[PDB]
Write a protein that binds this ligand. Structure first.
Ligand code: MG
Ligand code: MG
Lengths: 223, 223
């Protein structure tokens, strides 16, 4: 039940081939991790798979349909409708409450405000922030802000979450809390593709792609 | 040449007096730091001085005029016109370039786009990011993102910068780079009030207020 495929993806950045021909697929419901040395192309690949950057060569298919990277507005539309993102950085809006931050993407897509606020409240309860709904981000710790960002990532019921180093800058306890959140999300059926520096975190996922110098050099599958 | 004064500031949060009666002033051009144990009220004070939160009791005067905290829109107006903010977190907008992120506040105040973009480019050059103008935030490291945030803080030519733990999550080299940036800004004449966990950073400032249990308990002046 493919949800994502890449075919012969290459990416040139400043005259160098950062990605050198990658093909992969991801099934609906799968938790896939990507590991490899710094400069291997892991984040570059994730940004292409997540419709943030276009490939130089190759094709990407989302839910079995080829992605057209040539109209920015239409690409943003598809991305906002289908995908959610978590990064090391939380990109909260500091003048808005934790609740308001979560419903932003829903309002953007035209979801009615009542319905949107209820969803933002369900999501935030789900992620241990029911008590911080009205808090502004500069009041929240990094770990709490990550939980706001994950709630927001789930706002439009995405079919795929992309996570780029989601536990960076997080202590042990918050790293475990956030990884457990991802595990529970994936259990509910949402696919996740996660780039990580931590092999111990990759070990908790169903499949790991190992990268080196812009190629996939290894694949690890865990049952 | 007073730029800021607080008179008998108290702040009740969830039925407890977090700030218990604080009076202070800051002169134009001064670099003031605030230190003290966790729970001393340092960040709470900074948010009131920076017009982000209202006091429960007391008065704040900015450029010798009493601040009215009762109309949110008018308070936001004054804050956006006069003050800039740096936090441990960078609050960048990840779909916008480093340049676009800096001019946001200028456009908000009605500054023409050409003039705004030139300023955003001057500021970013000034802070070692001239080469990252078109980079999206998820490409930038935490240290670089802080430099984008400091540029943005300077966008409307504020009379006062407030910095809350601006070097948290930053390594040694970036901590020094960011502190040096603050020192250069202050040299140019901009006042800065900075909350920090690091006494070694407070030692580089002109004056330090020491807090304990919601009061100023000590003051250190350095020439
Ligand atoms: Mg991680
Ligand atoms: Mg600091």
């Amino acid at each position: 039940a493919e949800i994502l495929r890449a075919e012969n993806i290459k990416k040139v950045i400043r005259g160098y081939e950062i990605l050198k021909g990658i093909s992969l697929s991801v099934k609906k419901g799968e938790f896939v991790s990507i590991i490899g040395a710094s400069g291997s192309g892991k984040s570059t690949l994730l940004y292409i798979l997540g419709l943030l950057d276009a490939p130089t060569e190759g094709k990407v298919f989302l839910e079995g349909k080829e992605v057209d990277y040539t109209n920015e507005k239409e690409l943003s539309l598809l991305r906002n409708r289908k995908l959610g993102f978590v990064f090391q950085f939380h990109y909260l809006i500091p003048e808005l409450t934790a609740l308001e931050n979560v419903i932003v993407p829903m309002l953007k897509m035209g979801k009615p405000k009542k319905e949107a606020k209820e969803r933002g409240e369900y999501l935030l309860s789900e992620l241990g922030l029911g008590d911080k709904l009205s808090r502004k981000p500069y009041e929240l710790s990094g770990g709490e802000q990550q939980r706001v960002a994950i709630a927001r990532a789930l706002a439009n019921e995405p079919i795929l979450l992309f996570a780029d180093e989601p536990t960076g800058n997080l202590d042990s306890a918050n790293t475990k809390r956030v990884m457990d959140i991802f595990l529970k999300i994936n259990e509910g059926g949402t696919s996740i593709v996660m780039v990580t520096h931590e092999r111990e975190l990759a070990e908790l996922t169903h499949r790991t792609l190992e990268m080196k110098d812009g190629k996939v050099v290894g694949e690890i599958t865990r049952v």
